Assembly symmetry: D3
Homo-oligomer: 175 residues x 6
């Protein structure tokens, strides 16, 4: 099947969403769900020796300003495999402009890892961890000559509002 | 496609079955085949720092008392990736009650790893290895507050009889 | 879906082909795409403690003399996951007879890893690396009692001609 | 040299101690510093498929009731290699009796990972993580037939007092 | 210190020997103990994509016909780190001539992994595993142009006799 | 022993030097040889999700402007373990100022990996790989607030001249 089109955005939107993971934490390979076939594709290898600091993927049945599904970052202790579904609780949102496009990213934790039970908003995350994620997105494209701007972080409510917006952008694009 | 519904239970049932692996040996993440979409899903992260001692999954087109496909444990030297099909020879069966449900698990070896050619019954397995598997299932849910009981091990013939039962439970559930 | 039948051979054939990876570099497990279901299958475990020196897979919508899709070897620094699509530039071809069947294999590099930008023909590859790949295929089946013969390497143009041949063998087999 | 005898307990005892790591997080092999030669030794393989949830080792120039150097658990994101020195801040202590011996264990974070800058006492640690560590020590010896009892957790000040005690036990044993 | 010269051959020679591991199972890098400094050294990278099928190292205070300490192969489930001491029970011996030198290798299991408790002689090892080890040593130097000959396997008593011989060769060389 | 002080700079200086590796490629942990004890120490965890693109360490019996042994980067396919000695051929040098100190770094390949036999000067390295290494050093300290400047790359002869300089700086510092 095609996970992007055929999975709902979540079981309890926007408190709990599905994250379909494309890139496990620790990868330098930039995998993406091929929206046409539903297969994993290598988009590129990052040009710098950086690794994804989070399990990285999409919320199904969403769309966004960069012409792709809405980006989601899930904090996993043990990374998952590509194309794994995780039930995720949004706790904040990274505000990023990428090559002139709004490209904000939900920050979420797995509902079903009790380690994260007390992570519910952006203030629960170690500051240095937010900084490491922002810095990755600030510099990972530098050798590609693409401009990114990290504006800061929003809280869980702002993240949830943006999830609802992305869900509507999908309905409008794909009727 | 949906591997659970669209794959036969095996090529030479019950001497050789297909094992569709959900969890590679060494994982703490409890992956499962999502029976609705056919995608891998993170059910939960184990609450304790334990890892699956076997490649763990299901026999396709089976059903069982816990309301899931029949559980199978494949002894792999190098773990496979989730959603890999392995041709497996049943050699025994772990007798487990889980939260009040019968939830026995086939123990099998890969037909096409010659390392295991002389493993054909439960007496061929190192005792300490059977004990390690049983102990994992005895304690892995303890922090979840769920009761499990490991009653012992049955031999290859008992395992094969249970495989035939599970194949019939599927036909009856899904007509 | 079924990647073998439903993916085109490439976006710019034969300069750029799709490689659907079955076996990540470093694996001893011989995974293959199950042509019937589209799932990954463990064909066997290699009988010797050897590992695949390349990310190994197939070109979609091709066929070959051994009754399988055309084999492709992609040089990846970080191995991909099974069933990942890579856009690959053919740079040469390994000439192999396997159990009496022609079973040549394209050698390719990822288009979107800039590390390999200057790899465009067989003369760009370290000699010892070509030798290591050939030796793997010379000896990996020795304990299986199967005869293989490595005849040498052809250049990028010869590889591209063989890709076109394999594309035609598929059209003829599957009408 | 011999790290146990020739390294000081820490640079700013008891606020900052040296942890000499024996077992990286994720290991099932129970490595220990051989107090005679200073080499790493495999004491045993754990009898169950459990892994160390922390980087595990000793504080140099300490001694304890079980006739070994004082145990320390360092929370590392990326595990270190055996025999690595880490500057560690004690934040709490696990109260354990092991086979009739007091065998409490310092819980510490690396000073020089900014991720942990705000971890300073036992209340800063996710409850489920404390539970996972305690459960590991509650059950990891069960198949060895050895009795352990986990009594609970003490805070950073109690941990620091115990570090000072262990430093004195060493001076007395080794004059 | 220098592990080769300053560690005894074993705690209960020849029933239990110390194996000082140089190369973890799964490595392609050919590490060796530098007999001069006691540090690990990269001797070479194997010329073929083969990996050590066993944890590989030496028995301390031994010497052998190839002008090196006596080779020992320890069957570990989880590989150890280089320079780890393992208490090992010899169960057999691989008979190998290497570049004209006798270079037999003890096959052993860890005393303190209960998985191997019933492995006590060469007949306890899966035939395919013995074949995989022999084949590795038959072919791993082929691209280096060095001749090796594998003559077969001896039993535990023959292995123990050879351990005693190697212990004496050391005493004579190093007085 | 103490590898920094007790190992010679190389077997054929400056054509072949010893590299004592501190940090395997792929690590985010910044390990260093503790010059006092000879043990591995965690200096810090990098503040960003970057990994060392090379096996990273020192040339023994050298000194440099930043008050440390001369830095060396060895291109290894399979990373080594910390404190491994590699015989390395210098092929170039990265020109870096770090926090106001000259802190150039030799780029080298392992003599005994035939894959690199034709790598002998800076022009043999893929441009994108040089760029990835430079970019790592340009940005890896950015969150630490430390200024680095990468000025470019010198060739093998310039690297060899700098190795001779560093060897002399050591003799003068340590008499
Ligand atoms: Br994304
Ligand atoms: Br299951
Ligand atoms: Br193939
Ligand atoms: Br300890
Ligand atoms: Br050896
Ligand atoms: Br350095
Ligand atoms: Ca995009
Ligand atoms: Ca983007
Ligand atoms: Ca995006
Ligand atoms: Ca269930
Ligand atoms: Ca169950
Ligand atoms: Ca079940
Ligand atoms: Ca075939
Ligand atoms: Ca073939
Ligand atoms: Ca083929
Ligand atoms: Ca003890
Ligand atoms: Ca204890
Ligand atoms: Ca203890
Ligand atoms: Ca030798
Ligand atoms: Ca030899
Ligand atoms: Ca030898
Ligand atoms: Ca420095
Ligand atoms: Ca520096
Ligand atoms: Ca430096
Ligand atoms: Na995306
Ligand atoms: Na199940
Ligand atoms: Na194939
Ligand atoms: Na201890
Ligand atoms: Na040796
Ligand atoms: Na340095």
């Amino acid at each position: 099947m095609n996970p992007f089109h055929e999975l709902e955005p979540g079981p309890e939107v926007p408190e709990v969403v599905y994250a379909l993971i494309e890139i496990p934490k620790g990868s330098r390979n930039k995998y993406e769900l091929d929206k046409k076939t539903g297969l994993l594709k290598l988009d590129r290898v990052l040009y710098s020796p950086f690794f994804y600091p989070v399990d990285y993927g999409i919320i199904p049945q969403t769309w966004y300003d960069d012409g792709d599904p809405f980006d989601i970052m899930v904090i996993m202790r043990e990374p998952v495999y590509p194309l794994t579904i995780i039930e995720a609780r949004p706790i904040g949102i990274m505000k990023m402009e990428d090559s002139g496009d709004k490209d904000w990213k939900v920050l979420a934790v797995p509902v079903e890892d009790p380690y994260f039970n007390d992570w519910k908003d952006i203030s629960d995350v170690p500051k240095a961890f937010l900084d490491e994620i922002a810095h990755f997105f600030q510099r990972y494209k530098e050798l590609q000559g693409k401009t990114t701007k990290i504006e800061g972080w929003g809280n869980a409510e702002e993240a949830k509002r943006e999830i609802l917006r992305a869900i509507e952008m999908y309905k409008e694009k794909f009727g």
